[PDB]
Amino acid sequence: AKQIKFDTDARNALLRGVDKLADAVKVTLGPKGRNVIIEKKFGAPTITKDGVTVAKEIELEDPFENMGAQMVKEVASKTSDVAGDGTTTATVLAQAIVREGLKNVAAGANPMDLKRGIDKAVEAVVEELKKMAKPVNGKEEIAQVATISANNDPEIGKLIAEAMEKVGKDGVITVEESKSTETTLDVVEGMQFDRGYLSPYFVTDSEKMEAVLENPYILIYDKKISNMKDLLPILEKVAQSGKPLLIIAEDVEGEALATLVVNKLRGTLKVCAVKAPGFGDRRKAMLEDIAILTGGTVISEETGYKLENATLDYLGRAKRVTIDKDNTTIVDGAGDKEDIKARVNQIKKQIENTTSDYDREKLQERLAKLAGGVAVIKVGAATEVEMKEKKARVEDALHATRAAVEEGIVPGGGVALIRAAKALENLEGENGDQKTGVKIVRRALEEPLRQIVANAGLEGSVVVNKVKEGKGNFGYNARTEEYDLIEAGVIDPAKVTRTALQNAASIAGMLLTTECVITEKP
Amino acid sequence: AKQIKFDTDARNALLRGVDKLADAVKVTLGPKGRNVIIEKKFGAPTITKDGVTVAKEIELEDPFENMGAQMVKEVASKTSDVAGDGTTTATVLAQAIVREGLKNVAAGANPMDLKRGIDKAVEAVVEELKKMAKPVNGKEEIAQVATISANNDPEIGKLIAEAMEKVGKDGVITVEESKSTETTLDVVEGMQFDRGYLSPYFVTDSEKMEAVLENPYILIYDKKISNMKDLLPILEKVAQSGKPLLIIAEDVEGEALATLVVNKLRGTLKVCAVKAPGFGDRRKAMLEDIAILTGGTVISEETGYKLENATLDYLGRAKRVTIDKDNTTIVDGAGDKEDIKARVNQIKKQIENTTSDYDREKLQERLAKLAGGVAVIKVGAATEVEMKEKKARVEDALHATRAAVEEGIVPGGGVALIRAAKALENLEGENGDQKTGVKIVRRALEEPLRQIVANAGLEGSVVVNKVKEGKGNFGYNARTEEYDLIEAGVIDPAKVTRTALQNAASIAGMLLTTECVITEKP
Amino acid sequence: AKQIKFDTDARNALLRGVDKLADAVKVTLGPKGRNVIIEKKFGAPTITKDGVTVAKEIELEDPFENMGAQMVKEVASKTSDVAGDGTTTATVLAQAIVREGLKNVAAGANPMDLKRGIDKAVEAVVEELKKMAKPVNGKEEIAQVATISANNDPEIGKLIAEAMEKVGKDGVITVEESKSTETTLDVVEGMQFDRGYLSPYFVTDSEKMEAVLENPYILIYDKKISNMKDLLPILEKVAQSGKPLLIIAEDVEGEALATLVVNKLRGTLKVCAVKAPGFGDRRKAMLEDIAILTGGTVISEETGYKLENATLDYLGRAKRVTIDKDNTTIVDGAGDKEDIKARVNQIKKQIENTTSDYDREKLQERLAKLAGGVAVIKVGAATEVEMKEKKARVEDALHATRAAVEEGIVPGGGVALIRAAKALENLEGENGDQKTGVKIVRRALEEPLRQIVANAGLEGSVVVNKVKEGKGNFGYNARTEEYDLIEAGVIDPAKVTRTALQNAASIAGMLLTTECVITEKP
Amino acid sequence: LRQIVANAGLEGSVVVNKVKEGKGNFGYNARTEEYDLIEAGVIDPAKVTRTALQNAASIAGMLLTTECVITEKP
């Protein structure tokens, strides 16, 4: 059986679910935010002042409210930032826009024209957000934005600024737990390709949704993997080696996947599988390049090596690898460097050889991918737990600084969306309903400030009004209850605010244009 | 343990079920439709904008309503097109006609006369629709209709136009996931006959309800297969070979099918089985034809070969074999080309020799279905996921172009059904109740147009009146809201509209003349 | 505090009330109808096969149904005939038309078009009945029709035939309760004008709703009477005389009416009041004519006569004055015959003198009513109850024959309405709903005969078809179960059928086009 | 206009759109269902419709701007 709700009843149930998730999450917004307690099975109370954590333990009894909750949760979480105020800002914006849109279109508006107006004004406000952002490019200012990112600790800001200078803007920087007491920085060779694991049952660091293998074995394979019968000796010699093996194959599926899941869950064998990087003839190209990186050899039928022919000598070796959901990192592939610079030489020989722009672009990407290198930081401090907290801080600073160099910075604390609303002053849609949608999103842009100061328990209207009278970077610093942000340095990357607003507009559009809902009866 | 309802109670239960299904499907219609949110048992909620997926997720609690919903879903699913607006329009028309039919028979009308009137007016509307559809005949206009089908992309338009002129009007196209970055076209030998798999548990790609093999083995058999004891070594040598297996036999049933299902579901073996193509002497001849196409040999008691005696040498080989419910395709059978052209020459020799027209026609269709070959559209693009949706787009374009060349094209958006109402102006039945049925099906032809514009949020009355005031292909472009459809390039094949209206009439008549419904006690 | 109900719910309540009334009443229709027991507060319960008595005792609990029943009662009661089969036929036709009309309005029909179609169709049926009616202009066939209306005893038939033959068509006949055993007929001087009593508290014979004054005194007043103080001497001398008084004046209202009502209800003074005949100058002239007719004198200020000084000599003298709701008869005004014939001579002197045709027509009307006289039939028999029963029989015969010569005669038993359905075969309105209304009333014309035969316990479809295949006056006679009505002597006047059908169509028109009913909460 | 044309059982939107397209005294004659009103002779004084519109605006404003209704218990 399946329950079905149509039109206003369905939309109201979805609004109820989204409102419940909002009031669950919106309270933990800002510096002076509230705290939410969690009941966990066979454990103590745990409180959380971060909106990402409180979101994930939301699941409602009523199926309709539940789908609304999971809808806003998923579309809101597509933003890049995970440190904070990325999944909460989007959620409060989504609640605001959805509430006003549904509760106006109940008063006789056209939902589709409302969605059109919402999208138009979101385009206008993201354009203004791009215009407003101050770019960051240079050592002193990336150090400054890192320090603002790292809770005002100059040394981590200096370290990360230096690192992103060494490797390059588009380059890759990774952090890892160290054994020493000092903090230092090296840049090694390595690869990172945007193909993650094949199933989620390899995550070792469940706290961070990543799987890590130490001193692994890398099999460079080109063909498919379907059958259990053919990969026995590799697994046996890996178990006899007592080290992990990471599987890079064309397509692992079926009984092979079932068997490796079984032995991974049982813990007998530390194994992980990822999709093969590249595409086609260039899949073969980057596969043989990463083979010569890691020091192994390719296993492919064009050179007459069956899968079971692979041995210790043919396998590829490195030190550390991380398998996140999207990408995968290879750092310091244990291979002789002379052939690596020979690879780079033949790469530039290809540069001067080729003629077509598509070839030039893709192989310049390859050059940056191999010769660019991997920045590694040996974060270290006095005690273990403080070192864990320090590496967490380094990771958050890395993400924030990467976003800042990507698309500038904006005055944070909810005032960026205030100053971005100036572009909505003299914009009129094709009809009255689109102007209504423009007004709705204009009213919704200021809700982060309203709630960031409502969490502080002050009157919101006075502060938002006298923030609106200002211009430039004038705004409310919620931490100190002052009225400057230019250099006060409570800032957010423009990218996180832009994508939070875009996601909120998207989910509001998909939610205002729904008049049918389908759920199971328990 | 059964509940039986009679007469108006049963018909009202059917009306309630069909109304729920249609309202669930009516929402997603036209280019300005609205969303529907459906959860899966595990994971994210899913948003949809086509009626097909929403149709597949309807199943109600009251058994009578569920029964009516399944009824209309099944008969509405019989339209050949699967892209969209074929099953949605069928459900819309069926709900409209059924509603008005019950809502008129409450006034004392005779349901038999209503059914006869609906059928007669539907036949007249089909005749007018056929007279209205413009023919498509020429590579240029085939390219145009392909481009309109493919969201205004000329490269696919020229691709399918070239393929269609190369293979022929009744020829066969097959789309495959290339490994290369360029989309090329080839003409290769192959086969196709209208019979599929013997069990619904045998689908590999459940996304499109179709099973597929890659580089299989083809055995040719003449008799039945019933038991396990007679087909051990063929399966053993296949499993040692490590390739999939296609099976052609007279009929497979019983323990053989049971063991095949076990070995497939367990994943030990890749196998397939479809029925024999032809009949009598024609079965023997066409079996020999597929055998000499694929390079194998026939197995039969007439020539003294036992199924166990078959070996690798006798087996047939191919590269891509596709099995769906109705048909199946063989491409590039590994055979010697000289023997195939010799077969063609012997076929035409018999064509000159034969005299009877029936055997003549059988020979011409055999010659066409053998010598024509299989076109191979190798769909290549840059990345993987964009290539995959590209493959989906060209599959949809292939189906749409095939329908358009089959039975012409007409204005889309429901305008074709509007313009066909001119034929029913002077069509009167034998009695008054048939005239009421004619009026009933007249009033339903504008319901599709009324709902494409009702999802747009505008009053359907003005647009339908003002398009009735027009003539020819004057129509409502729901995308851009101007009033030209002649060259504007929003259309539908006349075949899909014809089939949708006919299926709607069939279910309308079958529900109108229903007065007893039997279901079980939960 | 008043309840309000709109839309189809109010019409459903009205239909329920009409259904209750019709089911109470329609069982009595026909020659062999059924019985309707009714509750009597004091004494035995009453049984009646006569529908008008059954109709008068209908009043339901839920006010909307009472409201609907009362509307049908009020419309149907306006039929000229009171003997029977006039109100019941109208009720049955209204039931059929209203039920079919609601079922078709719920089918999706415009009530405006349905009402207009019913009006057009009933006009067509009225024209057909006009065409089909056999005229009665002649002494012999009025004798036959009188015999039919009197249950086949020729004596009363020839009596009323001669009474007509003397009195004239527009001339007026009354029934007098005779004292002698023999039945005698007299043509005497009398008067008639259509002005009834001023209040219903004047009725003496409530069985027929008419007030009778035996040998009364009549005064002829020209001015207005309002209050008590002027009329003391007149009622003083009248009470001293011990005979009734007939009040003819311009208008009586207020304290004067209160006084005469008071002394009437107590029985102290037996009196009756009716307005003067004509208008203005015509009132004065015709008041003076009735004054000469009754032997009295006018009481006008023009001749300097007050009312207080009026004496018995100025009063008029007659024998009987039947005061009903609308008419009032004078018989044998005690006036010297020479004077009235001289006044007739003066009327003819005025007829030749005047030139205008309008005044000529009114003077001819004056001559006809004055010189025409009033025929009186003295009905006599042996016993008491037999003589009153014969009085009732002749009263019914008088009404029946009057209507019959008014508009002819047609076949009875609903056959006239059946054969009148031939006209509606080729009548089509401007649009479909009008044709639906035409069909609705065509089915409704079948209902009188269908109920007539259903009360006989037979099957309606067989007889209604077998009557329809016939032509002319071929029809079903339920008294003897034969199939001829030409000379079988079961007919009804065309006037009663026409009036019943028109009244039924009118009530249907008012009821189908109602969308709010406002009632009183108990 | 929607209610006068809906009391006749006709769909209001088409009539109101196609009379709004007209200019001047072009109008819908409900008695005859024709589309001219200049000399056809269905006229209302400007005073009656003016005062009707004034009173409608007044009652609407006075009912919108009302927060509490004070009524006796039966």
Author numbering:
A (entry chain N), B (entry chain M), C (entry chain C): 2 to 523
D (entry chain B): 450 to 523
Authors' account:
Chaperonins are essential protein-folding machines, classified into three structural and phylogenetic groups: Group I (bacterial GroEL), Group II (archaeal thermosome and eukaryotic CCT), and Group III (bacterial thermosome-like). Using ancestral sequence reconstruction (ASR) and protein resurrection, we inferred and experimentally characterized the last common ancestors of these groups (ancestral chaperonins ACI, ACII, and ACIII).
Finally, our structural characterization of AFCB (Ancestral FCB Chaperonin) revealed a strikingly modern architecture. There was no need for the addition of ATP to generate a stable, homogeneous population of double-ring oligomers. Unsurprisingly, AFCB closely resembles E. coli GroEL, sharing a 71% sequence identity. Although resurrecting the GroES-type cochaperonin was beyond the scope of this study, an analysis of key residues involved in the GroEL-GroES interaction showed that all three essential residues are conserved in AFCB. The Group III chaperonin from C. hydrogenoformans, a thermophile, showed the highest rate of ATP hydrolysis, followed by AFCB. AFCB and ACIII showed similar patterns, with a small initial increase in LDH activity before stabilizing at ∼75% activity after 35 min. Tracking these probabilities across nodes revealed dynamic shifts: residues that potentially prevent double-ring formation in ACI gradually gave way to substitutions that favor stable double-ring interfaces.
